[PDB]
């Protein structure tokens, strides 16, 4: 503390970077998220606090489309999250322009994690206050899902959660048996887990932003049709 | 052509423990002479001289820049320049302007500060060194100096006969060319003295 947690370039006496240790606290404080790799795809899901009913239908959505087959579910400081999503979109576009075809998810996650590490390495710039999952599917490489901490590195996840209640979500995620369940029931189950996570116990009403990618969508990461997934929300309510 | 814009003819030859550098003293545009006392032989040291041939403006610019670099190097080191090192410095200075070359063909003539070993070399416009032990020349009529030297030069020559041979070659060459002449300056460098002579030349 004191003089060591002032700039990211200052190492702790024990050998730690306290700026990122505090940036992780913003992710821990912001709303939670969940992403599950189904048998033939990856299903996302994020609850979003409607801080006031003055807002329209779900805006500043935690889900983003960084590429044609790749989607990003982010939590934490949302402005820097959107800036990082723009960075990821630019990286995917550059890779498609240079090497053709579609950017593999592992390489995209590695590059964006390296960019985040570059931002947390120096002193003038500050570490990003956001953690996100990158999910994509392809016929060749199946379904992948990588999660990036505000300072850490991408890690392969069968199913991951980040935000306010990580352990509470992860317990039921590990309770759920993935790797053999189709993405439909996985949408139902991610909605169920999010509603199991507390929504109105001490906060306002929450909206359910759920994303899709898989062979059922032949790649092409898109937001699940909310009109037909309201019944999945109803099953989650029960 | 361009190298023959202002004329010029510079000679350098080797004797026995002595060197000799000579050059015409004519400056002028294509056809006319402007002055008969133009300087093309410049002393880089007590026993080391340089001769330049080409555009007179490029002659003076190369001389001034080389003097600047040489003075800086002498101040940095404190020991006198070796003629091989100065030829190298000239070569680098010329090559620094590879695509904008100074249209000059410098030659080096002098003695080692300690061993008193004669050293004569020539350089092209780009800066290729041509180190030999008999003679080098430059200018519009370099072929004439070659033709004269290939029969008037003798190895291990006394400084007096070296001066006689260099004077004969320069006078005949500036007589047989159309752009250079009207006076020949010659410097004889020995281990202890410098002999500067202005030859009796056809002023036309």
């Amino acid at each position: 503390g004191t003089g060591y947690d002032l700039s990211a370039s200052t190492f702790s006496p024990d050998g730690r970077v306290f700026q990122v240790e505090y940036a992780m606290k913003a992710v821990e404080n912001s709303s939670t998220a969940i992403g599950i790799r189904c048998k033939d795809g990856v299903v996302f899901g994020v609850e979003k606090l409607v801080l006031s009913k003055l807002y329209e239908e779900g805006s500043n959505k935690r889900l983003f489309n960084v590429d044609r087959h790749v989607g990003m579910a982010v939590a934490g400081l949302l402005a820097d999250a959107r800036s990082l999503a723009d960075i990821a979109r630019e990286e995917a576009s550059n890779f498609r322009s240079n090497f053709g075809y579609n950017i593999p998810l592992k390489h995209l996650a590695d590059r964006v994690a390296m960019y985040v590490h570059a931002y947390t390495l120096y002193s003038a710039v500050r570490p990003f206050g956001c953690s996100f999952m990158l999910g994509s599917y392809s016929v060749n490489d199946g379904a992948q899902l990588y999660m990036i901490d505000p300072s850490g590195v991408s890690y392969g996840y069968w199913g991951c959660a980040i935000g306010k209640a990580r352990q509470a979500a992860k317990t039921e995620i590990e309770k759920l048996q993935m790797k053999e369940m189709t993405c439909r029931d996985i949408v139902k189950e991610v909605a169920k887990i999010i509603y199991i996570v507390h929504d109105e116990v001490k906060d306002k009403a929450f909206e359910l932003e759920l994303s899709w990618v898989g062979e059922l969508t032949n790649g092409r990461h898109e937001i699940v049709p909310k009109d037909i997934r309201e019944e999945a929300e109803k099953y989650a309510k029960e | 052509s361009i190298m023959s814009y202002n004329g010029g003819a510079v000679m350098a030859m080797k004797g026995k423990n002595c060197v000799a550098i000579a050059a015409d003293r004519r400056f002028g545009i294509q056809a006319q002479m402007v002055t008969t006392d133009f300087q093309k032989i410049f002393p880089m040291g007590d026993r080391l001289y340089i001769g330049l041939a080409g555009l007179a403006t490029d002659v003076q610019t190369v001389a001034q820049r080389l003097k600047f670099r040489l003075n800086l190097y002498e101040l940095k080191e404190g020991r006198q320049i070796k003629p091989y090192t100065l030829m190298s410095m000239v070569a680098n200075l010329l090559y620094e302007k590879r695509f904008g070359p100074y249209y000059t063909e410098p030659v080096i003539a002098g003695l080692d500060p300690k061993t008193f070993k004669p050293f004569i070399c020539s350089l092209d416009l780009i800066g290729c060194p041509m180190v030999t032990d008999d003679f080098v020349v430059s200018g519009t009529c370099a072929e004439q100096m070659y033709g004269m030297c290939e029969s008037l030069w003798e190895p291990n020559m006394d400084p007096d006969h070296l001066f006689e041979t260099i004077s004969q070659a320069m006078l005949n060459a500036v007589d047989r060319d159309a752009v250079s002449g009207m006076g020949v300056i010659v410097h004889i460098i020995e281990k202890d003295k410098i002999t500067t002579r202005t030859l009796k030349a056809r002023m036309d």
Binding site: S9, G15, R16, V17, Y122, Y155 | -
Partner: protein
């Protein structure tokens, strides 16, 4: 003050920032062992996987920088990946500028020079990750080197990095002092028993990931579950 806050020389005549980064390598809870043998060099590090929701396929700390050089990383994972990317870029750039493949010692020297530039100046900070890189080199046999956050690139025969690196180095010093060369069975077994004595869990053949570079067979073999299980069975026999 700020002697211990920025990369500046201390009044006592020391550099505290890199001294803190070296302990940052200890932070993270991991260890690695590198053993050079008669003809091969093997590196093994534990694979600490919390919960199975992670993909054990990609949680590794060892990578292929080029076709013949493999590294293992100890410390913070972000800086580790950044230095791995830098090493791969350096190897590719060396192969482009110079036809022959980059020697492992030269790659370690370049990485250590980058780290020394990092500990120089004050705008940036040193990367808290210690890299041990191995590779077969002609006219040199197996070669193992370590580049640290300071920039001191060295290490040979038996070298370890991590939290309990001192105990592993002591045991490997005892082993190398025992004058007997290790073939391509004894080197791997020596590394495995070193890491097992450091952290006594009997090393179920899923929590470690060993990289091997031999002379007759080049390339950085990341040995699979079957190979590590066979080596463990042979050792515990």
């Amino acid at each position: 003050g700020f002697d211990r806050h920025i990369t500046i020389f201390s009044p006592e005549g020391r550099l505290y920032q890199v001294e803190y980064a070296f302990k940052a390598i200890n932070q993270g809870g991991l260890t690695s062992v590198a053993v050079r043998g008669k003809d091969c060099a093997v590196i093994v590090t534990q694979k600490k996987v919390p919960d199975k929701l992670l993909d054990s396929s990609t949680v590794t700390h060892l990578f292929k920088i080029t076709e013949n050089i493999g590294c293992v990383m100890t410390g913070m994972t972000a800086d580790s990946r950044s230095q791995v990317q830098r090493a791969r870029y350096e190897a590719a750039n060396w192969k482009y500028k110079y036809g022959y493949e980059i020697p492992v010692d030269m790659l370690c020297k370049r990485i250590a020079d980058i780290s020394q530039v990092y500990t120089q100046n004050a705008e940036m900070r040193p990367l808290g990750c210690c890299m041990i890189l191995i590779g077969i080199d002609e006219e040199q046999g197996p070669q193992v080197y370590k580049c640290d956050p300071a920039g001191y690139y060295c290490g040979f025969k038996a070298t370890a990095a991590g939290v309990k690196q001192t105990e592993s180095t002591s045991f490997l010093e005892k082993k190398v002092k025992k004058k007997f060369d290790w073939t391509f069975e004894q080197t791997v077994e020596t590394a495995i028993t070193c890491l097992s004595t450091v952290l006594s869990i009997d090393f179920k053949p899923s929590e470690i990931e060993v990289g091997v570079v031999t002379v007759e067979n080049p390339k950085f073999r990341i040995l699979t579950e079957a190979e590590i299980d066979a080596h463990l069975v042979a050792l515990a026999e």
